[PDB]
Amino acid sequence: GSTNPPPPETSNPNKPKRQTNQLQYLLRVVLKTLWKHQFAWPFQQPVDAVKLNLPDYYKIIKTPMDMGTIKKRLENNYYWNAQECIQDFNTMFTNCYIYNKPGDDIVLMAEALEKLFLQKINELPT
Ligand SMILES: Cc1nnc2n1-c1ccccc1N(c1ccc(Cl)cc1)C[C@H]2C
Incomplete structure (x- = not known):
């Protein structure tokens, strides 16, 4: 697998934001x-x-997402609402669970971060 795909978009002037x-x-x-x-x-x-x-990673994961992309989206006011952003976090965790297996070290790491994430979004501003 010789190259990485281009990263997800982080800026889009035309998107509702x-x-x-x-x-x-x-x-x-x-x-x-x-x-x-x-x-x-x-x-x-x-x-x-x-x-x-990991030459198979982008064969399996077709909607990549990561917190660096999310952070840039947030900074660039990419999103219309918080649900859109929450969905990107969920895509990130889900990708990790798809590519890997329960018990793998990376999965334990995602599980811990996800637990935190869920604790933090349990109550949101109005
Ligand atoms: C995220 C994520 N989703 N899958 C993986 N990644 C990684 C991203 C960047 C660096 C390492 C990663 N992994 C990884 C990170 C820490 C440990 Cl202890 C073991 C494996 C594996 C890779 C298959």
Whole structure:
């Protein structure tokens, strides 16, 4: 597998976008808390399948997502509402569970980050 795909889009002037209190919270509180977790690092940028020697990763994962992309989307006011952003977090975790297996180290890492994520979004601003 010789190259990585282009990363997901992080800017789109034409997409409907808003700054909501929930989207501000998702950047300021949720993403920033997660970012500092000991297990965050594999999720801080797109999977580099070339470096990691995973030539099947982008054969299996067709909607890549990561917290670096999310952070850029948030910073670029990409999203209309918090649900759109939440869906990108869910895609990121789901991708990890698809490519890997229960018990794998990376899965344990995603499970811990997901638990945190869910705790933080349990209550959102109005
Ligand atoms: C995310 C994610 N989803 N799948 C993986 N990634 C990774 C991304 C970046 C670096 C390493 C990753 N993995 C990984 C990270 C930490 C440990 Cl202890 C073991 C494996 C494996 C890779 C198959």
